[PDB]
Amino acid sequence: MVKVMLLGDAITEITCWRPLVWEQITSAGLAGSVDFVGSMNDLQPNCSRPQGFDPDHEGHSGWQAYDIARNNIAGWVQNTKPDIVQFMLGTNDVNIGHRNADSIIGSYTIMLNAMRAANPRVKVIVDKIIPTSWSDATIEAVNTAIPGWVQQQTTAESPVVIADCSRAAGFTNDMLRDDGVHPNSKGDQFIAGQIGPKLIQLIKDVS
Ligand SMILES: [Ca+2]
Numbered sequence: 001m002v003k004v005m006l007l008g009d010a011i012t013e014i015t016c017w018r019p020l021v022w023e024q025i026t027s028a029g030l031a032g033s034v035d036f037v038g039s040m041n042d043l044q045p046n047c048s049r050p051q052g053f054d055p056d057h058e059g060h061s062g063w064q065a066y067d068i069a070r071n072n073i074a075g076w077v078q079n080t081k082p083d084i085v086q087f088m089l090g091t092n093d094v095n096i097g098h099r100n101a102d103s104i105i106g107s108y109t110i111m112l113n114a115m116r117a118a119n120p121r122v123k124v125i126v127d128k129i130i131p132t133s134w135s136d137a138t139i140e141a142v143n144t145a146i147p148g149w150v151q152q153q154t155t156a157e158s159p160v161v162i163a164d165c166s167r168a169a170g171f172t173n174d175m176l177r178d179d180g181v182h183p184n185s186k187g188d189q190f191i192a193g194q195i196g197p198k199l200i201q202l203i204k205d206v207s
C-alpha cells in the first residue's frame with residue numbers, strides 16, 4: 001500500500017479535486033494500492049464521491065504554512081508516516097497572516113525538513129498556488145520562487161516535484177468562487193488534472 005498525505009488549507013478541505021483524483025487513481029488500476037492518510041476526513045456534500053473513495057486528508061481551512069511548519073507537520077507525519085506528501089499552502093499566510101513570499105518559502109523548507117526527518121525517502125509534490133481573483137502579487141511571488149526552491153531542495157533519495165496549479169498554467173478567474181480565493185467546480189477539475197498525473201507517477205514509483 002502507498003500512503004499519500006494531501007496536506008493543505010481550505011483549497012484541500014472544502015473542495016472536490018480529491019474525489020476527482022481518486023477517480024484518476026481508480027482508472028489507473030491503483031484503487032487497492034493507495035491509502036490517503038491524515039487527521040481529517042470531511043468532504044463537502046456537493047462533491048461527487050466515487051465508489052471506494054478514501055476521504056482522509058490533511059487540509060485545514062484558514063491554516064497557514066507558517067503555523068503548520070512550526071507546530072503541526074511533525075506530529076502529522078509521525079502519526080501517518082506517508083510515502084508521498086502533496087501540498088498547496090501559502091494562501092492564508094498572505095490573506096490572513098499578511099506574510100511575505102520569503103516567509104512562505106522558508107516555511108516550505110521547515111515543512112520539507114520535518115517530512116524528511118520522518119521519512120528520508122519521502123516524495124513530495126509542491127503545488128504552485130492557485131491565484132486570487134485580484135491576482136495577489138505575493139501569491140505570484142511564491143510561484144516565481146517555487147522552481148528555485150525545488151531545484152535547491154530536491155534529491156535523488158527524496159524527490160520534490162511541482163504540480164503547477166497557477167495562473168500561468170491556465171487557472172482562470174472563472175475557476176474561482178465569488179469569494180475570490182476558493183476554486184469552484186471548474187477550478188477543481190483544473191486542479192485535479194494538474195495534481196493527479198504527478199501523484200499517479202509517484203505512486204507507481206513507490207510500487
Ligand atoms: Ca486512508
Ligand SMILES: [Zn+2]
Pocket residue numbers: 041055056
Ligand atoms: Zn480515514
